[PDB]
Amino acid sequence: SLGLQDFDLLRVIGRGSYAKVLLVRLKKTDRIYAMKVVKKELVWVQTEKHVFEQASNHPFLVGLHSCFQTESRLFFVIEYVNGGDLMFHMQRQRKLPEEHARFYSAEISLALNYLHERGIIYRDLKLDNVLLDSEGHIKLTDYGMCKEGLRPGDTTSTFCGTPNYIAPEILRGEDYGFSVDWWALGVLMFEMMAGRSPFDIQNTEDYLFQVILEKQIRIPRSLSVKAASVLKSFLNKDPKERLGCHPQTGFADIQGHPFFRNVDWDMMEQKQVVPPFKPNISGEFGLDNFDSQFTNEPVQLTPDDDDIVRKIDQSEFEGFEYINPL
């Protein structure tokens, strides 16, 4: 098993609700990785590990290098995507052309299908969870909400995801399948092209929840008819009527839609399409592509509290140690 003593701590590159992501280097082999550090007081474990395993054999998914744990934390050594995420690259761009959004959402669609056809529901597709690589493509990370074991026709009932991206099915307490990932892609595509969440522009987070359920998505007049229809078909409140939520004909419907026409999906799956935007790898390790609110934090791990860490049931993390064998 690997350990904290075998990795060099370079920079803090990310923070979320569950983990702190650090830029690391394996000291033995000089390779550069990212390390997702999850504290066990918040903490699945069967699912997030096993999903990082699958994702290692795909071009648009973040792969798993090794897994190890400490008395207080869980560590995920994964790939390092040195172009940043879509959120960072959206607060600067503010709005994307339809040609660009079509490129990213197509690559996301392929990655999502690969998950869908393996029995996994991403259930957390957002700007933060999509990363740009050095060449300009995308990769999906953070499988904390992922579901596992969906044999054809199964549904789950877990209320989870990002507040802005939760599908109405979840908000109505219904059982749901892969339909929730194409809703999030709809909300994501709306953000790329409109430049704003379709739900932002009982009273502040439950206000959003009612908006997501009761308000109507208003497409700006500057968008095309194909862009408008691809958002209205992805943001359809009825999961049985939504685009991609068509039993057997799901992905084919997404590939046949006017917006996703003239697109070569087999060249795209083979990384043969030319990205519209190539990240400007500036700074050490391309760290100028990450927010300075994290890369200015002291590069260290937060001290432990023997009174808090003595309550953790360590008989649930028994087989977390893992090293990917190529």
Partner: peptide, 13 residues
């Protein structure tokens, strides 16, 4: 800070 898109953390309950 004030930004166009705001970082949102995932929720699970």
């Amino acid at each position: 800070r004030m930004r166009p898109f705001k970082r949102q953390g995932s929720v699970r309950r």
